Each structure stands twice: as C-alpha cells, then as structure tokens.
C-alpha cells in the first residue's frame, strides 16, 4: 500500500556505511546530462545527439535510411543508425538498395563519428560537479574491497574528476604512450586493496584502433580512429568481469540515470540476480515509474532488486507508492553520499 521513504533511506545509509560489502556503480547518460555549464545541458543525451545529427546531416536520400530503419524498428537513435551503417559497410555491394555510390555511406559515417567526437569532448566545470563529490566520497572510507564503476557513456569526465582529487583508477590498459591492453592482469584480479578500477562498457573517445592485428589502444584523442561503438574482445572482458562480480556473495550495486533500455545489460543483470541469491541491485529509476515496463517485468521476475521512483515504488515484487524521493536524480544521490561521508 504505502512504503515509508525514511526506512529505505536508513537502510541505504546503513549498507553504504559498511565496508564489508563490495559496491558497484552504473553511470548511464542520465548522470552526465544532469550537469549543465550553461543554461542548456553541457552534453545532451543520445536523443539530443541524434536530433543534432539529424539537423546537421540531398537530405531526402539520407532520410531514406531513417525511414528504412523505422520500417522494422522504432525511432532510431545514434547507436541504431551506427549499427545499420556498419552492417551495410560489412557487405561490399550493399549500397545498391539505396543506390548511393559506393563510399557516400562511409563518408557519412566518418562525418557522424567526427561530429560525435567533437561534441562529446568538453572540459569539466568547477569543483561543484557531482563527479568530484563522488570522487571525494571514494577516499572517505578505507574499504578493504575496491568499489567498481561501470559507465555506458563516451566522454572523459569520470577520470578527470577522479584524478582531480588524486584517487587511483584502472581501466584495463597499462602504459603511458601506447597503453597496450593487458588480459593477464585482468584475469588474475590480484590487485592492492587501495586500487580501484573503472570499467568502460561502451568504450571511450581516447580508445583507438591500430588496425594491422586489430589491436585496440588508448592515448591522445585523435580524429577518425575511435571505438565509440556500443556493441558493434574488450566487450566480453567487460561482461565477464561484471557477471563474476555480481555472483560474489553479499554484493551491492547501485545505478543512476539508467533507463533499462539496454536489453543485453538487463538480461545480464537478471541472469546474475537469478544465479546469485545473495546479490542485490538498487535501481534508481528516473521520472515516472510507468516509463520502464521492462523494470516492472524484472522486479516481478527477480525479487533481488528494488525499484524506486518519485511517485511509485515496488519492493520485493510488491507494487506500491510512497506515503508523503529526490534520490532519483544524480545531484541528490551525490549530496546523500557526501553527507554520509561527513
């Protein structure tokens, strides 16, 4: 019927105040858009980027691609159009359906990647950002188990904020000039207690492909050679580590700004929750609860996750609502974390 916010907040503070249970973070596009340097948001989300690409790009020939995507799929985003372009470029004689030369689609893809790389790269504003506040919270407690951070974005705000307060982090790559990716150190998982690691699921802009042996590496951000691709084997390196951490007994994972639209991530989370009875994931849904039916399906099927919104909440596979939750947004979550820290 009615669930009291105070009890849930107290339980969250209690579990966050204990260093025995390892913690994880999921930072989707909803957190980065919550910070605005100007009146407008500093970086718009996937919808904003898709709108900008559509308004910036005859235009009818380009729009035929979105029409073809909409024929069998809903309103496509940047990821959907990128996947379609990559699939078309996989087959040499695939542009005959649209009858547009043999390299116009590749030129459009290059223009799109240049546009997204130029748009996403921006310097962080002053120390009032929630990212700096979370980084400060990282050093607050001397946890014996490092906290893991998973990001689905593309920018470099996380590492900038972390290094602004001198906290170590590790993304798999080791090196100063080429940063050759290592698999042995990731598989060994023998790291010091003070060493935390930040894992990039969808890649970053500084990631580059050296071609030749198809080896990926990170370094100075260049133009063209980017691995922004969400799904397009580093991706398995992300997924197996995430799954292995989910199955650790007495593990807690928190998410913010994630709309449950990524089916594969939702499937992985559901599989991990079913596999591990001791796992626990807190979903901080945004806007209204009705906006994510997959969240309701996961809550009904899996009883190890709790979903809370600004108006309604479902705890233990039991539908309900508050009895008059600002924590849905990233700013209030960061404020909660910092007042716990003090």
């Amino acid at each position: 019927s009615y669930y009291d916010t105070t009890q849930q907040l107290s339980l969250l503070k209690h579990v966050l105040s204990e260093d025995k249970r390892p913690i994880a973070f999921i930072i989707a596009a909803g957190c980065p858009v919550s910070i605005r340097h100007n009146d407008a948001p500093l970086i718009p989300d996937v919808a904003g980027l898709t709108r900008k690409i559509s308004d910036s790009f005859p235009d009818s020939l380009l729009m035929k691609i979105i029409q073809n995507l909409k024929t069998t799929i809903p309103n496509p985003t940047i990821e959907d159009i990128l996947s379609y372009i990559r699939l078309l470029q996989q087959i040499p004689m695939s542009g005959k359906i649209h009858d547009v030369e043999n390299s116009v689609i590749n030129a459009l893809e290059e223009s799109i990647c240049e546009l997204i790389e130029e748009e996403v790269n921006v310097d962080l504003p002053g120390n009032a950002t929630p990212y700096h506040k979370i980084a400060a919270w990282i050093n607050s407690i001397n946890r014996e188990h490092q906290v893991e951070i998973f990001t689905t974005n593309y920018d470099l705000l996380m590492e900038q904020a972390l290094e602004e307060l001198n906290v170590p982090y590790f993304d798999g790559f080791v090196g100063s000039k080429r940063a050759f990716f290592d698999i042995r150190t990731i598989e060994e998982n023998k790291l010091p207690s003070r060493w935390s690691k930040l894992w990039k699921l969808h890649g970053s802009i500084n990631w580059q492909l050296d071609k030749q042996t198809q080896t990926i590496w990170r370094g100075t951000p260049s133009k063209g050679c980017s691995l922004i691709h969400p799904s397009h084997m580093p991706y398995l390196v992300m997924m197996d580590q995430l799954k292995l951490f989910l199955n650790q007994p007495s593990a807690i994972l928190i998410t913010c700004g994630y709309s449950y639209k990524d089916q594969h991530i939702n499937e992985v989370l559901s599989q991990g929750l079913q596999t591990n009875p001791n796992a626990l994931i807190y979903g901080l849904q945004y806007d209204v609860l009705e906006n994510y039916q997959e969240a309701k399906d996961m809550a009904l099927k899996r009883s190890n996750l709790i979903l809370l919104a600004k108006d309604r909440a479902i705890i233990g596979k039991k539908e309900g609502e508050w009895k008059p939750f600002k924590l849905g947004d990233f700013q209030h979550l960061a404020s909660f974390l910092e007042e716990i820290s003090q």
Partner: protein, 613 residues
C-alpha cells in the same frame, strides 16, 4: 547462525556469515541479525522450532548468543508451546520474519481484540482476548514517567467500544479525579460537590454493616458504648419495621446487617438528651422532668448519662462538617426524624451500575483521608453483595460482568494492611472467579504491594521501571520469565508497554496505541509559570476572611453579559466558568465585535478587573 549446542532450555549459536550484521534483508523486508527483541527459528526436517533471543555477546560463551526456547509448530498447525526435538549441530537457525510473526501472532478467535502495534513492526496486531482481561484479573505497574494514564485510558476506551462491547461495565476508582477529561461524555462523573455535568456521590450509612458503622461513625467503640449502640440499632430496626412495612422484613428475622434505614439524627438526639438535661425531681429520671433532632442543637441531673460522651460529640461534629454531607446527608436518602426517605437503595444501585453508558467514573477526590479505607471497603463490598445476592437474576455480575480498577493501591494493599478494604479485595479474588467480577491494580511503586495478591492477577501491564527493587518484585510475580523481555524493562519509551499474562498468546512488548486526540487523561493542575508571571495587583482578603468564617466556597457576587449586573463573562475550554466584575458593558460589547472570541479578553479584561473562577 547455526545452532551448535543443546543445553536443556538455552541453546547457543555459532554464526558462520563473516560480517553480515547489516539488516539482512529477505524478500524486500529487512530483518536484523539476532537482536534483543528478535525471534529465532531452527528448522528440523518438517516442523519449525522457534525461539526468542535473551542475551547477545560474550555472556553466552564473539559469535555466541543466548537463545531461549519457547515453542514450536506441529504439522503446519499453529504456534504451540512444547517442542518435539531440540535441534543439534548441522542445521542453520533462521529468523521469524514479518509474515511468520503474523502467523505466530495470528488468532482465529473473534473474542481476541487488537490492542496495538508491535514495537518491531507497526503492522502486526496484539490480539488480546478481553474475556481473560475482565474475568481473571489485571495489574498495571510502572513508573509515573512512562505515561500510565495514557495507556490505561487507551485500554479502557478500546475495551468499551459500543459496536464491540455492547454489554460493557467499567468502574474506575480514580482518586485524583484525573479521568474527567479522559472520557468527557462517555462516562458519568460522581464527586462530592459536582459543578455542571456530574452526579453527586451519596452513601447511605444505614445500608452498611454494623462493624463499618462502629468504625466510621462510632470511632471504634468496643465496650459498653458499643453494646448500647447494638441495643439502639436493634430497637431502631424493630421500630422501623413496625412503623413501615418492608417486603421480606418483619419482627421475626430482623438481622443486625439488615439494610433498612434507622434514625441516626434522632439517635444522636436521644443519646444527648439522656446525658445533658437535668431531672426536675430527684429520685426519678422521668422524661417529663426536664429542668431538636434534625438540628444538632441539644436542649438533679439525669441518671441515664452514658460514658460515650466523646464519641457522641464526635458524631455531632461530623453531622455538621461539610465533608460529611455525602456521608450522612444523601439527597434521596435523607433520613427523616421517623426514618423515612424519598427513595431506596435499589435506586442507588440502578443509578450506579445501571446507567445507559458502558463506563462509569466514580471519583473519591474530595474524601477526607481519615476513614477513606473504610469507604473503599464499603463501596467494594456493596458492589460485590449487590451483584452476588442478585446473581441468580440476569442483572447480576455473572450475566453482565464488572471490572473495578483501584489506583495507588500500595497504600491500602500493603503487606501489613489490616483494614476492611483488603478483606473485601481478598474475598473478591477468592470468590468472584465464578461471580465474574474483575479487578485491576494501578500503582507506581510495585515494591510495596503484597506479593500474594499481585500473584493472583492474570495479566500485567509493565511500563518502564528504572529502580531494580521494582523489577525484582515484579519478577517475583511472573512465572514466564524471558530475559529478552525481563531485561528490557528500564528502557521503555513513554507510551510503550510489556503485556504479559493470559490475555496474550505470546508475551508482547507492544506499543499502547494512543487514544484519539481530545481524549488524553490529565488532571487540571495549576500552571506555575503562568500564575507567577502576571504582575502584582491589589487584593481583598476581607472576602477571604468572610468565606473562611462562613465556611462557604460560594461568593456573594460563550460570551454572556448582564448590563444591570455589570459582570462580563468569558468561558474557557473544559467547562471552566469565569465571572469578571467591574466591567462596563461597552467594553464587552466591543469585545463581542472584536475579532471573534479572544485577544481583547487577554489584552484588557485579563488583568484589569477582579475575576472569579
């Protein structure tokens, strides 16, 4: 948490979870690791062996706890006392979650009444059968700072629902008169000098036994005066029987304890005229040789003078004392010079235990402390005799049981108390089990009450008790001792209680649900800071002297008014009446047109004119 020991009635656990200890949540509800007030559950095959936690820490040997076994379930039947097989090593002990607690705290009987919410979770009810609460006994023990009035009044009001208890009958022997605001309109009020809406308590003295008459009126006569009083009482009873015919009463079987009125003012007049007036002619003491009765004024010396002049003088002084008005000057039982009253004692009984309400509040606040024990004994004995001698009719105590609550009983039920009230209480406790008369004790110093009388109470209401003597004395009277409940006594919040007895299936340390707003018991004590904060105004002690000489509390002097009388009147809450004098009518006319009903009053009428409450 897996049990690794069986020690008769206290098992010990060795938890294997490294550091769970953080409100281990199951199915969206957060259970805690073994706490003081939590419940345990050790599964053995098919039956669920439950338990209650008593002590935590090194006191059990850290990872050892002191678990106490209470009960277990049969074949999915219910919560049963008496285990089948105490668990051994190898099985993990689980906890009683919220639904499991509901099942344990669930009852199929509709006589069970939900009295509140468990302190653990505010949803699970305390199903309490009210038959046990009224039929056996009750007792309320705790410190005054724990809020005893609130919990007691809440229990009484919940017990008295018109839809749930249409045949209720509750008598509260409150001494401070603090329950008038508690049930303003749901209970009658009986005082000595009521003001607005209360009935006036009246006690016919001739309806009591001879021993009570000797104790209260005669002051404890035992020699010649007592026997003369016996002779006079027998003669007066015979004269009353002869003058007026009483059904079932004649000159054949006139007993000493006969509740038939006899002249007492005339008796005092005779006992004064037989020892005051002088015989006109010596040798004879004739009544015609003189050398009022209702009025206390009395008119060779008379040879029939008694040696009870001092008791007679005491009786005469009592007859004029205003505090004895409710004792000797009952309205409908005012004994005429020939022993004739407008009404009978059946009218008194109908007025007391036959009103249209379910709860009746009788207050002895104005009673003198000189014979209060005898008065309490008289009231209890009158109720018991009325509902026992008429217990064969459906109007007796059996067919509509009664519950009498006695507060601050440690002064009248002490270890060495030899009064008449304690005898009546013992008689009730030993006989009313079939007669269906309930009793509930209220006190704030349990260490003084007799052990055996408290041991005869069915269910206890344990509040916060900081001193350890009270804890020891209470533990001496409870036969189901759980250290989880035995040690939580001195840290109870103001409003919580521990209910242990036959009225609950399991010992519940629940929360006394507060009574609805507007019904909160509180005696009308003066406000020290409010009274002492006002500036000094001129006084008139001549009126005080006149009142003291006259021994009268009535002076000679909603916004009402009377321009001829120049007395503006403003009324406060709770039935308070004020009469501000020397107030020009224009001021009150402006006040009636000021705001609505306030401000102006405190602004000008509060501290400028002599008032009268």
């Amino acid at each position: 948490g897996t049990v690794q020991d069986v020690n008769g009635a206290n098992i010990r656990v060795v938890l294997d979870i490294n550091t769970i200890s953080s409100l281990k949540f199951v199915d969206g509800q957060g259970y805690r690791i073994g706490q003081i007030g939590s419940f345990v559950r050790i599964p053995i095959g098919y039956i669920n062996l439950f338990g209650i936690v008593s002590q935590v820490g090194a006191g059990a040997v850290h990872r050892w706890i002191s678990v106490q076994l209470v009960g277990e379930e049969g074949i999915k039947k219910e919560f049963e006392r008496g285990v089948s097989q105490y668990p051994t090593i190898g099985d993990k002990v689980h906890i009683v979650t919220e639904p499991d607690l509901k099942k344990i705290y669930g009852t199929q009987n509709k006589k069970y009444i939900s009295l509140g919410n468990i302190a653990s979770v505010d949803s699970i009810p305390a199903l309490v059968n009210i038959d046990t609460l009224v039929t056996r006994h009750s007792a309320v023990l705790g410190s005054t700072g724990s809020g005893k009035s609130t919990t007691v009044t809440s229990i009484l009001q919940r017990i008295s629902d018109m839809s749930q208890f249409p045949s209720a009958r509750i008598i509260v022997f409150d001494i401070h008169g603090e329950y008038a605001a508690a049930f303003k309109g749901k209970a009658k009020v009986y005082k000595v000098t009521p003001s607005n809406n209360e009935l006036k308590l009246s006690i016919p003295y001739w309806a009591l036994t001879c021993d009570e008459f000797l104790s209260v009126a005669f002051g404890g006569l035992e020699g010649s005066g007592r026997n003369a009083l016996i002779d006079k009482i027998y003669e007066l009873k015979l004269q009353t029987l002869k003058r007026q015919e009483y059904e079932g009463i004649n000159e054949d079987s006139l007993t000493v304890d006969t509740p038939i009125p006899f002249s007492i003012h005339k008796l005092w007049f005779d006992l004064y005229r037989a020892e005051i007036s002088t015989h006109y002619v010596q040798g004879s003491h004739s009544e015609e040789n003189e050398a009022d009765s209702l009025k206390v004024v009395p008119p060779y010396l008379s040879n029939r003078g008694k040696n009870i002049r001092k008791p007679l003088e005491g009786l005469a002084s009592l007859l004029k004392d205003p505090r004895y008005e409710f004792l000797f000057n009952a309205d409908d039982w005012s004994v005429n010079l020939d022993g004739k009253t407008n009404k009978d004692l059946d009218a008194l009984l109908e007025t007391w235990v036959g009103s249209e309400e379910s709860i009746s509040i009788f207050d002895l606040s104005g009673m003198p402390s000189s014979i209060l024990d005898t008065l309490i004994g008289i009231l209890i004995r009158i109720l018991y005799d009325s509902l026992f001698w008429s217990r064969n009719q459906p109007e007796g105590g059996r067919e509509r049981p009664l519950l009498v609550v006695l507060e601050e009983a440690h002064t009248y039920l002490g270890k060495d108390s030899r009064g008449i009230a304690i005898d009546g209480v013992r008689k009730i406790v030993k006989e009313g089990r079939k007669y269906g008369i309930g009793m509930m004790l209220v006190s704030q110093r349990p260490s003084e009450i007799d052990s055996t009388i408290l041991s005869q109470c069915g269910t206890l209401f344990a509040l916060r008790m900081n001193n350890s003597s009270d804890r020891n004395h209470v533990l001496g009277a409870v036969s189901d001792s759980f250290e989880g409940l035995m040690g939580m006594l001195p840290t109870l919040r103001t409003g919580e209680a521990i209910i242990i007895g036959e009225s609950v299936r399991l010992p519940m340390r629940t929360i006394i649900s507060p009574p609805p707003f507007g019904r909160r018991p509180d005696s009308l004590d003066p406000d020290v800071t409010a009274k002492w904060s006002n500036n000094r105004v001129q006084g008139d002690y001549k009126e005080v002297l006149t009142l003291w000489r006259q021994k009268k509390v009535r002076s000679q002097r909603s916004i009402g008014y009377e321009a001829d009388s120049m007395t503006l009147e403003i009324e406060f809450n709770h039935g308070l009446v004020y009469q501000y004098y020397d107030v020009p009518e224009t001021l009150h006319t402006e006040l009636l047109a000021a705001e609505s009903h306030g401000k102006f009053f405190n602004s000008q009428i509060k501290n400028n004119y002599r008032f009268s409450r």
